[PDB]
Design a protein around this nucleic acid. Structure first.
Ligand SMILES: [Mg+2]
Ligand SMILES: [Mg+2]
Ligand SMILES: [Mg+2]
Ligand SMILES: [Mg+2]
Ligand SMILES: [Mg+2]
Ligand SMILES: [Mg+2]
Ligand SMILES: [Mg+2]
Ligand SMILES: [Mg+2]
Ligand SMILES: [Mg+2]
Ligand SMILES: [Mg+2]
Ligand SMILES: [Mg+2]
Ligand SMILES: [Mg+2]
Ligand SMILES: [Mg+2]
Ligand SMILES: [Mg+2]
Ligand SMILES: [Mg+2]
Ligand SMILES: [Mg+2]
Ligand SMILES: [Mg+2]
Ligand SMILES: [Mg+2]
Ligand SMILES: [Mg+2]
Ligand SMILES: [Mg+2]
Ligand SMILES: [Mg+2]
Ligand SMILES: [Mg+2]
Ligand SMILES: [Mg+2]
Ligand SMILES: [Mg+2]
Ligand SMILES: [Mg+2]
Ligand SMILES: [Mg+2]
Ligand SMILES: [Mg+2]
Ligand SMILES: [Mg+2]
Ligand SMILES: [Mg+2]
Ligand SMILES: [Mg+2]
Ligand SMILES: [Mg+2]
Ligand SMILES: [Mg+2]
Ligand SMILES: [Mg+2]
Ligand SMILES: [Mg+2]
Ligand SMILES: [Mg+2]
Ligand SMILES: [Mg+2]
Ligand SMILES: [Mg+2]
Ligand SMILES: [Mg+2]
Ligand SMILES: [Mg+2]
Ligand SMILES: [Mg+2]
Ligand SMILES: [Mg+2]
Ligand SMILES: [Mg+2]
Ligand SMILES: [Mg+2]
Ligand SMILES: [Mg+2]
Ligand SMILES: [Mg+2]
Ligand SMILES: [Mg+2]
Ligand SMILES: [Mg+2]
Ligand SMILES: [Mg+2]
Ligand SMILES: [Mg+2]
Ligand SMILES: [Mg+2]
Lengths: 92, 49, 246, 61
RNA sequence: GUGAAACUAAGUGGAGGUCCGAACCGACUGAUGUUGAAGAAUCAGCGGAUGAGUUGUGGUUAGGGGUGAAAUGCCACUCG
RNA sequence: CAGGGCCUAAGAUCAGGCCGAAAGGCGUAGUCGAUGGACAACAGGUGAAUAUUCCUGUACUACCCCUUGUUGGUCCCGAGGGACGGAGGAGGCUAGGUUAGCCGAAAGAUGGUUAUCGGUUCAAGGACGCAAGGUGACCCGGGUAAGAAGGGGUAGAGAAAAUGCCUCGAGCCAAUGUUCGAGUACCAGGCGCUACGGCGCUGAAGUAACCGAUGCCAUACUCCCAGGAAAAGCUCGAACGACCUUCAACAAAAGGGUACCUGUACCCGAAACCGACACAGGUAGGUAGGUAGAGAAUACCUAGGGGCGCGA
RNA sequence: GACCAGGCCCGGGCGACUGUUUACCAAAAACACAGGUCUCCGCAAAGUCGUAAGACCAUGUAUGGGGGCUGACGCCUGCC
RNA sequence: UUACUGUUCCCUGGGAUUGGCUUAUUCUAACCUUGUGUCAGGACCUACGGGCCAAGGGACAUUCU
């Protein structure tokens, strides 16, 4: 019942990434890029996106940068579309 | 009467024989993986070297 | 097989501090520890010999015992033993080799080994290869006997012991052909003090092959090396001694 | 095939060096607790040079 | 072969701090270098190379000390 | 995949306890501690910089749900097992290599010539199963009664185990191999485009023999003395004690669903580590081609990487 | 036929031999060595390290352990 | 080092720890040693140890002065 750690769930997602490679990844993989907290997990991020936008998450992959900042690859299920969700935010 | 024992004995050995070879196969994978030479995609590139 | 284990005191020669107390110990081949039964409890049951195994932790062989209750034990190997011989530990046991019993029920002039000095601690004396202790006499409370050193000690009567002589008597006959056989046992090279420097040993200095140059030979710690008896005066076991070895 | 005489630092792993010069090692003995007292009054930035975490980019494994 | 042994001829067997010789570990001679490419190396030969062998990783022994197949040698280019 | 969430050695700490001007020292269970044990994945493709990590295809492990059955279980505890040396050589296989065949292309201004050039490839895993290999009592091929692997039963402090007794059982052991995976996928070559990058179609044949491992069967066998870790996972099972419970727990097949933390860049027989240098040096381990050769020596070459950071 | 790839013989001294040693001027005739001898120790052992508790020796028991000298083997090892 | 002055290991005596009956020897109750003997908590201590009961020594020795 307990999570791994305890902190602000609304801080798990700071902001997305806007790069020519990231935008290229949305159309090919149906994925999304998000900078995340260092203390975050794949479970909290999976639960997070399920609540904000109301969409299913096929898989989550993460990594820690050299600067101590964690990044999160989020692949949505094929039923939904990351490009459609992208336009809802404002970024293409 | 005796066919029941002989018939069940072979099935009892086949399952153990089946699991025993699977055991020796995975340990062979764990062995050469520690050596660092298991993936054949990496070995065929280093066949002539 | 279950009596063998690898839990031993690694780091031979080194104490808790980690300094060398017993010198010239190190190297050597690895060896597991065998659990030998010296108390010889579980009395009044027969047990036969099946194997005659090699014990690296001693000079003598051992013998595996199989009792009717399924238990298994190790014991020393007597001299004329053969596979199939039985052994018993008790009081009214017949006086033959391999059996164990107190000294009260033994006759005079018996070949004895695996003697205990106190009840419960188990046998401590006459363990080595070809060892034997001859019972001279007994008188009331205690019983005197002879040891392999030739000394006549006075042991209590209620102490247990095993009959016969220890196996593999012919072990001194082989000479270690070379130095490598010595290092296999875990015995490092012995250096002579007369070659050292004066700071290391009292015999050190001097050009050429120096003589002793001292009133007597001395240990590395100053005391003499010959003649000085090291037995503690007024020891607790001083009355149990009949004479000195020779 | 012999290393020169001055090679006293053979690039040993940081895991072992932390077990010999790390923060937890100093706080065990009384001298190490006084060692840090000297380096704090000195005002040194890095109190223990030979230390690493159990995880992250610094982890030796 | 003998009364039985001792002894003795072949074959099998593949022992050894065995032999030659790379890696690996060592460093006997000479040259070169000697404000060196290098605070001990390069070049040409040399020794051991199944053993008392070599080596990694992780540890132990700390100075009126430790360690030393013992040179007063080594113990962070520092050791009477 | 590697490490942790599992185990333990060396060794370090140590509840209490013992000792001691202080600091503290010794020390029991216990806990930390990989250099070990245990535990589930491959091929191909994509490509400014990453992929056994992303995509495709085919698998595996754990947990949960579902469907029946069972209906006391789960720890503690007992036992088995894990569990191990060196040397030596023989045998059976494969990797790999060579040649041949097949397919395609080729005229490389010379005296002659195609004898030339290139390709001939594919894993983890699932299912089946093996000798003329090794092993297993009986004879000089046959016969025969015990006997192997692997099971069952029984007595005693006595569930399992151990010990003893009785009994069934000619077959067992595993690298390799067959088949699916495995598609006109991959591929030489050819047809067209160009900013010359590659793109887009097309895409034949895809076999055999010999040599043969330092690798696999293999802690297989033989010999020898120096006599060759531990714990957990796993498996079997009573009593005592503890916790929980009619499913809310154990157990079996299929199907379906779900899937923690850290490392992952780059150099690594080095210009990036260690040597104060972009230093003729040192740096564990893995992969091991062709000709000659006993050979991983040596000489010349392939893949691939280089022409040594002042020159004339 | 290249590269690669043992020079040998007679005699003597020391040490038996394989090995180890002064990292950076000494690899030896020095050290070690198997063996031999003397002496100590009967286990709560001697010895060794500690203020002490205690540890090693040893989970060993006089065919074993510690210490001194000598140093394969062969002939010997005298007198006070 | 058979230089001077000292320290330590070790040996010995007096005193404390330390007691009883006899003519120095014995006795057991202090003290020393041992137990895979036994009991013990939620459980274990066959993991040191603790309590109890035994065994061997015994007023010696260890320790302090
Ligand atoms: Mg990751
Ligand atoms: Mg090659
Ligand atoms: Mg000298
Ligand atoms: Mg002196
Ligand atoms: Mg002298
Ligand atoms: Mg002289
Ligand atoms: Mg090297
Ligand atoms: Mg040799
Ligand atoms: Mg050689
Ligand atoms: Mg050297
Ligand atoms: Mg050279
Ligand atoms: Mg050489
Ligand atoms: Mg030579
Ligand atoms: Mg030689
Ligand atoms: Mg220190
Ligand atoms: Mg000082
Ligand atoms: Mg130095
Ligand atoms: Mg893994
Ligand atoms: Mg405490
Ligand atoms: Mg402990
Ligand atoms: Mg643990
Ligand atoms: Mg590991
Ligand atoms: Mg894991
Ligand atoms: Mg790259
Ligand atoms: Mg076992
Ligand atoms: Mg032509
Ligand atoms: Mg039973
Ligand atoms: Mg990567
Ligand atoms: Mg990489
Ligand atoms: Mg390397
Ligand atoms: Mg280099
Ligand atoms: Mg330099
Ligand atoms: Mg070659
Ligand atoms: Mg070469
Ligand atoms: Mg060339
Ligand atoms: Mg140039
Ligand atoms: Mg340069
Ligand atoms: Mg240059
Ligand atoms: Mg030569
Ligand atoms: Mg002369
Ligand atoms: Mg010599
Ligand atoms: Mg030599
Ligand atoms: Mg020198
Ligand atoms: Mg030499
Ligand atoms: Mg020299
Ligand atoms: Mg020397
Ligand atoms: Mg003692
Ligand atoms: Mg000499
Ligand atoms: Mg008790
Ligand atoms: Mg107890």
């Amino acid at each position: 019942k307990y999570p791994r750690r305890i902190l602000d769930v609304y801080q798990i997602l700071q902001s997305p990434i806007i790069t020519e490679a990231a935008i290229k990844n949305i159309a090919d993989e149906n994925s999304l890029l998000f900078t995340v907290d260092v203390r975050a997990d794949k479970k909290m991020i999976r639960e997070a996106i399920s609540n904000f936008f109301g969409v299913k998450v096929r898989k989550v992959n993460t990594l820690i940068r050299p600067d101590g900042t964690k990044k999160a690859y989020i692949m949505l299920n094929k039923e939904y579309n990351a490009s459609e969700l992208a336009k809802k935010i404002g970024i293409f | 009467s005796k066919l029941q024992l002989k018939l069940e004995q072979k099935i009892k050995m086949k399952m153990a024989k089946k699991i025993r070879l699977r055991r020796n196969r995975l340990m062979r994978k764990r062995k050469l993986r520690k050596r660092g030479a298991w993936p054949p995609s990496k070995m065929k590139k280093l066949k002539n070297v | 097989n279950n009596l063998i284990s690898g839990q031993r005191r690694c780091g031979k020669g080194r104490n808790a501090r980690g300094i060398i107390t017993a010198r010239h110990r190190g190297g050597g081949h690895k060896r597991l520890y065998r659990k030998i039964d010296f108390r010889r409890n579980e009395k009044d049951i027969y047990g036969k010999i099946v194997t005659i195994e090699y014990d690296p932790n001693r000079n003598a062989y051992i013998c595996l015992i199989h009792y009717g209750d399924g238990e298994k034990r190790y014991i020393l190997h007597p001299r004329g033993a053969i596979i199939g011989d039985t052994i018993v530990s008790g009081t009214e046991v017949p006086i033959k080799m391999g059996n164990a019993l107190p000294l009260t029920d033994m006759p005079l002039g018996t070949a004895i080994h695996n003697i205990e000095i106190t009840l419960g601690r188990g046998g401590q004396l006459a363990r080595a290869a070809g060892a034997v202790a001859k019972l001279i006499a007994k008188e009331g409370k205690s019983a005197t006997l002879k040891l392999p050193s030739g000394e006549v000690r006075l042991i209590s009567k209620n102490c247990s012991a095993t009959v016969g002589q220890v196996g593999n008597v012919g072990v001194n006959q082989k000479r270690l052909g070379r130095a490598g056989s010595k290092r296999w046992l875990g015995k490092r090279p012995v250096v002579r003090g007369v070659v050292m420097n004066p700071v290391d040993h009292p015999h050190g200095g001097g050009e050429g092959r120096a003589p002793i140059g001292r009133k007597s030979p001395t240990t590395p710690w100053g005391y003499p090396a010959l003649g000085r008896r090291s037995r503690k005066r007024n020891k607790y076991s001083d009355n149990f001694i009949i004479r000195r070895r020779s | 095939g012999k290393a020169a005489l001055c090679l006293t630092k053979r690039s040993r792993s940081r895991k072992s060096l932390a077990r010999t010069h790390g923060f937890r090692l100093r706080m065990s003995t009384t001298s190490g607790r006084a060692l840090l007292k000297r380096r704090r009054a000195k005002g040194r930035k890095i109190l223990c040079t030979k230390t690493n975490p159990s995880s992250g980019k610094r982890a030796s494994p």
